[PDB]
Amino acid sequence: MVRFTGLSLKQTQAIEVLKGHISLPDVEVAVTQSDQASISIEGEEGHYQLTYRKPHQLYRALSLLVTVLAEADKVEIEEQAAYEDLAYMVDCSRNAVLNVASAKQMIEILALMGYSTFELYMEDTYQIEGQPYFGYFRGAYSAEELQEIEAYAQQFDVTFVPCIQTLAHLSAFVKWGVKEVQELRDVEDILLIGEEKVYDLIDGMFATLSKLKTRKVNIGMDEAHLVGLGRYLILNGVVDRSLLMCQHLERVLDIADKYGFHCQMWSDMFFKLMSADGQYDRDVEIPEETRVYLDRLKDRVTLVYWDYYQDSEEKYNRNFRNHHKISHDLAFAGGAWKWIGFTPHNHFSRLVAIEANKACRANQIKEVIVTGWGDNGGETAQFSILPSLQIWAELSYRNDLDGLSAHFKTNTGLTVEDFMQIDLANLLPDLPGNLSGINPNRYVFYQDILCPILDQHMTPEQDKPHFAQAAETLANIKEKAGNYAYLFETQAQLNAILSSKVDVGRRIRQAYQADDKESLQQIARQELPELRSQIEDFHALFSHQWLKENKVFGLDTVDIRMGGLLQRIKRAESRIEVYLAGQLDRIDELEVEILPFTDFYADKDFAATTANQWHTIATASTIYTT
Amino acid sequence: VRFTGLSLKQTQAIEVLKGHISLPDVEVAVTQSDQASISIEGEEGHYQLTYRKPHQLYRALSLLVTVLAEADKVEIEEQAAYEDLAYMVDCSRNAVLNVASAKQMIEILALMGYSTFELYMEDTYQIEGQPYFGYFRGAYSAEELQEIEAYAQQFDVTFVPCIQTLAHLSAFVKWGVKEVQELRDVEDILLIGEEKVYDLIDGMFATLSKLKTRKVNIGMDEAHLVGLGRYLILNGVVDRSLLMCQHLERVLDIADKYGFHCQMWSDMFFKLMSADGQYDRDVEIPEETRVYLDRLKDRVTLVYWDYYQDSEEKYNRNFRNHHKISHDLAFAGGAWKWIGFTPHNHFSRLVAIEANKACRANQIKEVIVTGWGDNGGETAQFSILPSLQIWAELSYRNDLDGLSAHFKTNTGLTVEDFMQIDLANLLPDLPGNLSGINPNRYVFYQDILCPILDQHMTPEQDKPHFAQAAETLANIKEKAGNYAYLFETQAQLNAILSSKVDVGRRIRQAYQADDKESLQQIARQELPELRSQIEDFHALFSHQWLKENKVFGLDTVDIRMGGLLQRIKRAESRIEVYLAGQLDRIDELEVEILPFTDFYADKDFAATTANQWHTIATASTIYTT
Ligand SMILES: C[C@H]1N[C@@H]2[C@@H](O)[C@@H](O)[C@@H](CO)O[C@@H]2S1
Ligand SMILES: C[C@H]1N[C@@H]2[C@@H](O)[C@@H](O)[C@@H](CO)O[C@@H]2S1
């Protein structure tokens, strides 16, 4: 029933798509572009005037219109967005490659929220002609898929920015034991600077990207910690590593220029190579030769300061001030916390966004890139962080969160507080809320039974009912979550598992020590087989979730991890049985006293911690090393 | 049997060894003599047996039983080429040899002619005040190490711990506590010059000093990035050959404090001082390093290790390279048991014969046979007995003419039957002189839907080879006595491989041909059966492991095999979804398979070397962030 005047055909088609998310009421709306504001909406009694500064801003304007019209007839909206560009970057390199259909849904939602820009982070997960091992069995996007994704974003006047790697974070590529790949290597996950075959590869990266319309790219260059120290050192000897970086940076910028690209890079290696203790968060002594080189290069690249951790504006401001010593062409990357296992932390994301937004505004930052990393196997749902995305959008357009829940429900059908219950498996009640990375969702799940190396981080009196209540809270939200139900069903089941598994290893030890054989038998014969049944159920839900959002490729690692967990539970059953049958004097596993897993949060009152590597969660034995 | 001339200690040791060998009802006069390593004369039921060194009595007895089984008259005289022959067991790759198996190993080593038993322990021995060192790894207590040693002493066999004082400490340094992290340079390497590192090393030697032995191998191999991590950040750039010497001096000073005499792997001197970072190089020694190194080389024996060469002259070249630095050298050879589930006694033989030639020509005094367990310790500890008997024969006789007979006396199997244990590796079109080709492992752990090693499979030959191996090994199991477990495990493995070698390919063929009957059959019959077979193999493997090793470290294999099983279920479920019409394609099967590696791409055969579980099993990330 909605009637619009002043739209192009492109804008009317975009709106039809968006009717799949939002419900437009029966009113008349005159639309025009105007520089007066990012978004303005006025009128009453069913006749409204809507203006946008930039085309893509029509779609957030419509979300605002729908929302405000439910509680009032008169409308006085005026928004002035703080940032020239607000982007969302999805991790497609951690095993989870967003599928094209899910990319389109994400684009639609981002448009409704007010984002200008959609980005995919692809280390090796885009195809390059003549590089058959690059993205092999990883579900690398074809050039056609990226074009499709980008053209879809272009239907909403949302631009596309690929985030690639031109130095390090190429582990999945460089592992292939063929001459054509090994000759490109320096050390660990780092390409060999100065090798012409490496610049042939990088040229090929841009040949693929040049098939897109976009001429904006993030070239990576973060976290190349041993750059110059491997095969580079053997071949070339000791060199000034700050200058090595500039040299490599210059070659890459020249290749980009060849294709007409404008580059951004992560900023951290400048700080780590030019500070005394090799850290990001440092004031730097720039050697003069490097200063002269950076002075040239700074006019050709945007440096991206990334920080997901600080709880105050001042901390951000300090780093911004450090960055100004190098360059005033800066962007900021904030965090949509979805990289700590199975379960996001939209809560923590909200806490730090508020403070990062203050700092970005103070330093006239042109662009914020919200980053959804998927560290260590991509086990968190791609749509798990919609609340964090709306949060950053509200902060840009309105500089407050007053409209957050209403805008969110208009866009998704859920209140933001219901949706943010998705975080529950991380939200142990005794955590302060301002400390990052505390991820019991993941380490309680993948921990062994017989050898429970995180057991000192468990607080069963608190944790068991928290997890138990969370599973019920989430089944209730699932029932009202519409097409988002899958996300909550997955989390409810996980929480149900963690309710019992959080201390099953401890109860086995207490029974063993107390010589309570009836209890060991109960655990071995009833509880553990049921635990496997529940984990299998969870695996089925996870798989459904994964196949909805992502390509099939990379799910294999989760199959392996979860099958291993299941087999280790069976071991706990069988070892207990052998003991019960009188054919073991002792169960040696249980004779070992448990130590703290890590001391990272050892001085806090709470017991939980951060453990975010599957292979160290699951076993104290060797598993990847030789 | 009746002996004269024995001590109480000797008569006690012979009692134990009757558990392995059958002494005939004969009269033997025993005396020490310097005339030969071993001598045996006599006839008509009366024999004279001499030995040079006490432990050599036990080889002599194995010899006597053997020769008497087809002759009344005996004329034996052996002169061993090596002052010491040792076997070193890897107890650091997850598999920690349990005490009961240590005792069986010592007994067999005694019968073969070995003077020395060694255990390689990175973090798998207990250090007071270092609770994370060996944590949940089954680290030997001092009491256990003392027990293993005293048991070896019963046979006049000496004990030498092999430890790590620089790198190869990855299982220790992973632990994210300040007490451990402060000790780190980079990767698996300790931080040279950090006093808490030297506190740790002092603790290592405090544990070992509880032993009687005062001989130790201090490690120091393969510290490739030494100086380039935290060391570089804290201290800046330094001469890495001088850095090495500094650290080596600290370590030898600690050893001296506790009375130890040290050996070390020699590779880092060559790698740090060669231009291309390689071991097999004649190196120019920087002047300051030469001064430092000349001091140090008088305090440590260098161990040249090499397992891979089929020619004497390659060994000799490296001996020459070593002699430019020092003449205080020992040699380490290999009993190949570090390439998965299945050993390579055949390749071990090939290289032993040539290495023995080179060692003799360079007047090497001690040979250490090394039984590494790379990447999870999945090969059985007693899988390499033939390789051990080979080195013993090469030392004492300089040939293998007595090999099978002495082996049979010692184990109950002919050496030919025992070495069938290798079969999962012995693909028919391989030449026998190329190292590391291990289809036993990569055929087993490969995925079904995404078979990244498929190009290395030759089903026309591999399939019957493996099927025929399973039958052969089932026959040998039946005559193998207490070694039956070893063959039973391998028989089941070969049975699995005969179908798994191409199941991934046949799924792909069926899919492309649109042979849905065959996709159904594979999904509903063959793959569930394959899982049942793998579960049985897991059961057999577990039995073997728990018989030979401590329980710790089996968890990794559970994890790995658990994951394989779960991936086979995924193969089944993805095919069913396709068959039900709920996918237009199975994307996994649309990917063209490339060579896994080009390491042996120049050769006529398709097989290769692939010895990392995590890269065998998936092309996705799995340990990286
Ligand atoms: C520049 C980026 N490099 C890293 C990225 O790959 C993620 O692992 C992320 C979250 O852990 O941390 C940093 S931010
Ligand atoms: C000095 C030793 N270092 C390595 C050892 O740890 C094993 O990995 C072995 C077999 O691959 O290779 C070498 S020999």
Find the radius of gyration of the CA atoms of chain A: 26
What distance in Å separates the CA atoms of residue A136 and residue A176, rounded to the nearest whole number? 10
Helix (H, G, I), strand (E, B) or coil at A546: helix
CB A508 within 8 Å of CB A590: yes
CB B340 within 8 Å of CB B385: no
Q: At A558, which amino acid appears?
A: V
Q: How far is A242 from chain B (nearest CA, A)?
A: 14
What distance in Å separates the CA atoms of residue B39 and residue B59, rounded to the nearest whole number? 11
Instruction: Note whether A230 contacts B229, CB cutoff 8 Å.
Output: no
CB A365 within 8 Å of CB A332: yes
What fold does the segment set B401-625 form as a domain? Four Helix Bundle (Hemerythrin (Met), subunit A) (1.20.120)
A554 contact residues in B (CB cutoff 8 A): 620-621
Helix (H, G, I), strand (E, B) or coil at A494: helix
What distance in Å separates the CA atoms of residue A520 and residue B189, rounded to the nearest whole number? 42
What distance in Å separates the CA atoms of residue B267 and residue B305, rounded to the nearest whole number? 8
Phi/psi for B117 (5° steps) reads -120, 135
What fold does the segment set A81-401 form as a domain? TIM Barrel (3.20.20)
What distance in Å separates the CA atoms of residue B66 and residue B69, rounded to the nearest whole number? 6
What distance in Å separates the CA atoms of residue A82 and residue B464, rounded to the nearest whole number? 71
Gaps after residue numbers in chain A (C–N over 2.5 angstroms): none
DSSP state of B371: E
- Nearest alpha-carbon partner for B527 in B576, B493, B593: B576
What distance in Å separates the CA atoms of residue A514 and residue A505, rounded to the nearest whole number? 14
CB B331 within 8 Å of CB B263: no
Q: At B124, which amino acid appears?
A: T
Tell how strand A262-266 and strand A216-218 pair up. Answer: parallel
Give CA separation, B601 vs A261, B240, B619, in Å. 39, 36, 20
Instruction: Tokens for A65, please give them.
Output: 């219109």
In 10 A of CB A438, how many CB atoms? 25
Dump the DSSP string for A191-207: E-TT-HHHHHHHHHHHH
What distance in Å separates the CA atoms of residue A364 and residue A355, rounded to the nearest whole number? 15
What distance in Å separates the CA atoms of residue A378 and residue A345, rounded to the nearest whole number? 15
Give CA separation, A129 vs A179, A623, B440, in Å. 17, 34, 35
Spatial neighbors of A169 by CB under 8 A, at least 6 apart, are A93, A123, A189, A220, A222, A223
What distance in Å separates the CA atoms of residue B412 and residue B479, rounded to the nearest whole number? 8
CB A623 within 8 Å of CB B375: no
What distance in Å separates the CA atoms of residue A312 and residue A264, rounded to the nearest whole number? 26
Helix (H, G, I), strand (E, B) or coil at B162: strand
Q: How was this structure determined?
A: X-ray
DSSP state of B590: G
In the block, tokens 């792997």 appear at B265
Question: Cα–Cα–Cα angle for A197, A291, A203, nearest 5°?
Answer: 20
Instruction: Note whether A560 contacts B617, CB cutoff 8 Å.
Output: yes
CB B64 within 8 Å of CB B40: yes
Q: How far is B41 from chain A (nearest CA, A)?
A: 49
Facing residue for B176 by CB, picked from A377, A552, A600: A600
Residue boundaries of the structural domains of chain B: 1-79, 80-400, 401-625
The CATH superfamily holding the domain B80-400 is Glycosidases (3.20.20.80)
Give the residue ranges of DSSP H helices in A298-334. 313-324
Centroid of chain to Cα B536: 25
What distance in Å separates the CA atoms of residue B198 and residue B191, rounded to the nearest whole number? 9
Architecture of domain B1-79 in this structure: 2-Layer Sandwich (3.30)
- Nearest alpha-carbon partner for A541 in A474, A487, A468: A487
What distance in Å separates the CA atoms of residue A99 and residue B329, rounded to the nearest whole number? 60
Facing residue for A615 by CB, picked from B93, B611, B623: B623
What distance in Å separates the CA atoms of residue B582 and residue B585, rounded to the nearest whole number? 9
B129 to chain A, any CB pair closer than 8 A? The answer is: no
Among chain B residues, the shortest Cα distance to A614 is held by B623
Tell how strand A75-79 and strand A117-121 pair up. Answer: unpaired
CB A344 within 8 Å of CB A427: no
The interface residues of chain B toward chain A in range 583-602, judged by CB-CB distance below 8 A, are 587-588, 591, 594-599
Among chain B residues, the shortest Cα distance to A570 is held by B558
In 10 A of CB B416, how many CB atoms? 13
- Closest-lying ligand 2 atom to the alpha carbon of residue B222: 3
- Nearest alpha-carbon partner for A370 in A113, A615, A550, A150: A113
Q: At A122, which amino acid appears?
A: M
Instruction: Tokens for B269, please give them.
Output: 């001197």
Torsion angle (degrees, nearest 10) of CA B371, B374, B376, B377 = -10
CB A122 within 8 Å of CB A22: no
Dump the DSSP string for B343-365: --HHHHHHHHHHHHHHHHHTT--
Answer left, alpha or beta for residue A438, where phi above 0 means left and psi between -120 and 50 means alpha: beta
Helix (H, G, I), strand (E, B) or coil at A163: strand
Torsion angle (degrees, nearest 10) of CA B340, B306, B109, B57 = 170
What distance in Å separates the CA atoms of residue A169 and residue A191, rounded to the nearest whole number? 9
DSSP state of A146: H
CB B359 within 8 Å of CB B76: no
Counting Cα atoms < 13 Å in the Cβ hemisphere of B527 gives 27
Facing residue for A137 by CB, picked from B225, B552, B591: B591
Instruction: Note whether A172 contacts B558, CB cutoff 8 Å.
Output: no
Q: What share of chain B is helix, strand, coil (3-state, %, to 5)?
A: 50, 15, 35
Q: How far is A554 from chain B (nearest CA, A)?
A: 5
What distance in Å separates the CA atoms of residue A115 and residue A451, rounded to the nearest whole number? 47
What distance in Å separates the CA atoms of residue B124 and residue B147, rounded to the nearest whole number? 16
Give the residue ranges of DSSP H helices in B155-266. 170-173, 178-181, 195-208, 230-235, 240-257
- Nearest alpha-carbon partner for B440 in B541, B527, B517: B541
Beta bridge pairs of residue A77 = A41
DSSP H or E run through A623: none
Residue B376 CA to ligand 2 center (angstroms) comes to 13
What distance in Å separates the CA atoms of residue B507 and residue B519, rounded to the nearest whole number? 7
In 10 A of CB A587, how many CB atoms? 18
Whether ligand 2 lies within 6 angstroms of the CB of B221 is answered as yes
Instruction: Tokens for B475, please give them.
Output: 């026959």
What distance in Å separates the CA atoms of residue A345 and residue B438, rounded to the nearest whole number? 45
What distance in Å separates the CA atoms of residue A563 and residue A580, rounded to the nearest whole number? 26
- Nearest alpha-carbon partner for B448 in B542, B562, B268, B589: B589
Instruction: Tokens for A541, please give them.
Output: 């839900």
Give the residue ranges of DSSP H helices in A329-459. 346-362, 386-397, 404-412, 416-420, 440-446
Q: At A160, which amino acid appears?
A: F
Number of A–B residue contacts, CB under 8 Å: 204
What distance in Å separates the CA atoms of residue B367 and residue B357, rounded to the nearest whole number? 12
Among chain B residues, the shortest Cα distance to A379 is held by B622
Instruction: Tokens for A595, please give them.
Output: 């130590």
Question: Cα–Cα–Cα angle for A60, A63, A67, nearest 5°?
Answer: 140
Whether ligand 2 lies within 6 angstroms of the CB of B239 is answered as no
The 3-class SS string of A372-410 reads: ECCCCCCCCCHHHHHHHHHHHHHHHHCCCCCCHHHHHHH
CB A398 within 8 Å of CB A68: no
CB B301 within 8 Å of CB B245: no
Phi/psi for A216 (5° steps) reads -125, 135
Beta bridge pairs of residue A44 = A47
Give CA separation, A282 vs A273, A303, A305, A358, in Å. 11, 16, 12, 21
A100 to chain B, any CB pair closer than 8 A? The answer is: no
DSSP H or E run through A217: strand A216-218
CB B110 within 8 Å of CB B143: no
- Nearest alpha-carbon partner for A204 in A293, A110, A130, A257: A130
Give CA separation, B240 vs A138, B232, B288, in Å. 39, 11, 12
Instruction: Note whether B170 contacts A614, CB cutoff 8 Å.
Output: no
What distance in Å separates the CA atoms of residue B421 and residue B259, rounded to the nearest whole number? 42
Helix (H, G, I), strand (E, B) or coil at A263: strand
Q: At B24, which amino acid appears?
A: P
DSSP state of A175: T
CB B155 within 8 Å of CB A604: no
Q: How far is B618 from chain A (nearest CA, A)?
A: 7
Beta bridge pairs of residue B28 = B3, B47
What fold does the segment set A1-80 form as a domain? Double Stranded RNA Binding Domain (3.30.160)
CB A490 within 8 Å of CB A535: no
Helix axes of A57-71 and A9-18: crossing angle, nearest 10 degrees: 50
What is the side-by-side strand order in the sheet with A75-79? A3-5, A28-33, A47-52, A39-44, A75-79
DSSP H or E run through B482: none
- Nearest alpha-carbon partner for A293 in A242, A246, A239, A228: A246
Dump the DSSP string for B430-470: S-TT-S---HHHHHHH--SSS-TTGGG--HHHHHHHHHHHH
What distance in Å separates the CA atoms of residue B101 and residue B148, rounded to the nearest whole number? 10
Spatial neighbors of A179 by CB under 8 A, at least 6 apart, are B598
Q: Which residues of B565-600 are buried (b: 16+ CB within 10 A; e: fewer)?
A: bbbbbbbbebbeebeeeeeeebebbebebbbbbbbb
CB B231 within 8 Å of CB B182: no
In the block, tokens 């399939």 appear at B463
Give CA separation, A58 vs A34, A109, A263, A457, B66, in Å. 11, 13, 28, 49, 95
A95 to chain B, any CB pair closer than 8 A? The answer is: yes
Give CA separation, B224 vs A406, B75, B84, B188, in Å. 58, 52, 30, 10
Q: What share of chain A is helix, strand, coil (3-state, %, to 5)?
A: 50, 15, 40
Instruction: Note whether B620 contacts A138, CB cutoff 8 Å.
Output: yes
Beta bridge pairs of residue A206 = none
Report the sign of the C-alpha dihedral through residues B397, B403, B406, B411, in that order.
positive
Length reported for chain A? 626
Find the radius of gyration of the CA atoms of chain B: 26
Centroid of chain to Cα A455: 27
CB A573 within 8 Å of CB A524: yes
Instruction: Tokens for A4, please give them.
Output: 């619009």
What distance in Å separates the CA atoms of residue B72 and residue B389, rounded to the nearest whole number? 25
Q: Which residues of A180-203 are buried (b: 16+ CB within 10 A; e: fewer)?
A: ebeebbbbbbbbbbbbeebbebbb
Q: How far is B549 from chain A (nearest CA, A)?
A: 12
Q: Which residues of A468-479 are buried (b: 16+ CB within 10 A; e: fewer)?
A: bebbebbbebbe
Centroid of chain to Cα A236: 37
In the block, tokens 């055909």 appear at A9
DSSP state of B522: I
Residue A497 CA to ligand 2 center (angstroms) comes to 42
What distance in Å separates the CA atoms of residue B552 and residue B542, rounded to the nearest whole number? 12
CATH 1.20.120.670 describes domain A402-626: yes
In the block, tokens 């949509």 appear at A336
Whether ligand 2 lies within 6 angstroms of the CB of A626 is answered as yes
Counting Cα atoms < 13 Å in the Cβ hemisphere of B456 gives 26
Q: In this structure, which long-range contacts are made by residues B470-477, counting pairs with CB atoms below 8 Å and at least 24 apart in sequence?
A: B470/B494, B470/B495, B470/B498, B472/B420, B472/B423, B473/B420, B473/B421, B473/B423, B476/B413, B476/B417, B476/B418, B476/B420
Which burial class, exposed, middle or buried, applies to B26 when counting CB atoms under 10 A from its CB (0-12, 13-18, 19+)?
Answer: middle
Beta bridge pairs of residue A255 = none
DSSP H or E run through A160: strand A159-163
In chain B, how long is the greatest CA-to-CA distance? 84
Helix (H, G, I), strand (E, B) or coil at B115: coil
B276 to chain A, any CB pair closer than 8 A? The answer is: yes
Experimental resolution (Å): 2.1
Helix (H, G, I), strand (E, B) or coil at B159: strand
Centroid of chain to Cα A400: 23
Give CA separation, A505 vs A425, A502, A597, B245, in Å. 19, 8, 15, 47
In 10 A of CB B317, how many CB atoms? 16
B575 contact residues in A (CB cutoff 8 A): none
Nearest CA to ligand 1 atom 5: A373
In 10 A of CB B337, how many CB atoms? 29
Facing residue for A132 by CB, picked from B452, B594, B625: B594
Give the residue ranges of DSSP H helices in B39-98. 56-68
In 10 A of CB A432, how many CB atoms? 10
B233 to chain A, any CB pair closer than 8 A? The answer is: yes
The interface residues of chain A toward chain B in range 558-587, judged by CB-CB distance below 8 A, are 559-568, 570-571, 575
Which burial class, exposed, middle or buried, applies to B252 when counting CB atoms under 10 A from its CB (0-12, 13-18, 19+)?
Answer: buried
